[PDB]
Symmetry: C2
Subunit: 123 residues, 2 copies
Amino acid sequence: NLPTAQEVQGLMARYIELVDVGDIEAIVQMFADDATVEDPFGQPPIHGREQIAAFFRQGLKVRACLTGPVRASHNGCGAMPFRVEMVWNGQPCALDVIDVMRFDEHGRIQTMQAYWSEVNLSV
Amino acid sequence: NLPTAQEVQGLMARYIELVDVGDIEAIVQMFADDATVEDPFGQPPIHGREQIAAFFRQGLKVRACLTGPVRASHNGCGAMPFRVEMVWNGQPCALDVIDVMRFDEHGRIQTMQAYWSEVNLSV
């Protein structure tokens, strides 16, 4: 069902866990079959699991951690702050991002938006 | 004009500065005349400066600080994590919140949403 405020904190923390290990199949399955992702926000969305799996396969070998608590409401929404550490073309970077997610009546991610731009990159 | 990614970080940091000191007139003026606020999100919005000034007057004597960097995009949007420290009915609390804002073609807050619920309260 629509996750409660407490369920939203657990699902969102799991999500960062999965991104950190890089288990692409487990990440993809957290999304609804027709979920849409906007990352970075301002960018056109990617729709459906096929496109999301491709987006994630494209980006993972990273380290990701929650840098503060998951903020959650009573209507299936959540927002969380986190940092991603990578090494781009030999140089190590860090990216501070804030993800906002909406869950469906099944506890799956229906919509996701990531807020960040070059001003949040430390290369 | 539409603030750039860097302008969005400055405006949003100013905002927390103003909430921290409690300068209600200066806060109100950061919003568009017909801006809408949803705080906490999931709650019906308040529209226009009159209602926003009333909302803020109702809540201020607090301490507020940014707990991480402001995440900003190129389309006038920003998201930031912060903590508010108060003392409710004799007992001191803390509330972790994430605000998401959209700015207008003038650099004023057009829409604001705050994400938090009781799971983010430390009383």
